[PDB]
Design a protein around this ligand. Structure first.
Ligand SMILES: [Ca+2]
Ligand SMILES: [Ca+2]
Ligand SMILES: [Ca+2]
Ligand SMILES: [Ca+2]
Lengths: 145, 20
């Protein structure tokens, strides 16, 4: 598990943005302040749900280890999702937000595989949850996860 | 006899292999 000196410093910088009074904990109120600066307006119940899911020891506030543990997991999810989004843009040759059978067939060709229309149509139907005849990003991601 | 089908995940991973 990688955590360099520089990575630790960056986590403390992010933590300090939340930890308004520098006591080493993040409360629901400090989280509200940050969320409002992002243009959101959560209720106290919503803030408590956000704290609760990060608050591993259940003492009501977020300490650095809890914060870093959650942030590192979120960063990995975001990295992984971005890799999936990049693949989707590559497959979606005309950039219209759907992978068509023809696009999928050309993709296969470029990867050294020759499929018939029949075979690619099958692959599309497999992923085409909403029945529009093509594969959108949500449908693609569902096949990856 | 029959043709084997490819998966969406295998396609994704095949691209992953070919990139720098
Ligand atoms: Ca604080
Ligand atoms: Ca805690
Ligand atoms: Ca397209
Ligand atoms: Ca669809």
């Amino acid at each position: 598990d990688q955590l360099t000196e520089e990575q630790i410093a960056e986590f403390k910088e992010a933590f300090s943005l939340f930890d308004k009074d520098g006591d080493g904990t993040i409360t629901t109120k400090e989280l509200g302040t940050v969320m409002r600066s992002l243009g959101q307006n959560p209720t106290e119940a919503e803030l408590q749900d956000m704290i609760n899911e990060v608050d591993a020891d259940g003492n009501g506030t977020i300490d650095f280890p809890e914060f870093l543990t959650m942030m590192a997991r979120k960063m990995k999810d975001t990295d992984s999702e971005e890799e999936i989004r990049e693949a989707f843009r590559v497959f979606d040759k005309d950039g219209n937000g759907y992978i068509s059978a023809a696009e999928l067939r050309h993709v296969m060709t470029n990867l050294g595989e020759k499929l018939t229309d029949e075979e690619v149509d099958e692959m599309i139907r497999e992923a085409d949850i909403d029945g529009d005849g093509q594969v959108n990003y949500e449908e693609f991601v569902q096949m990856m996860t | 006899h029959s043709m084997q089908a490819l998966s969406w995940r295998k396609l994704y991973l095949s691209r992953a292999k070919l990139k720098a």
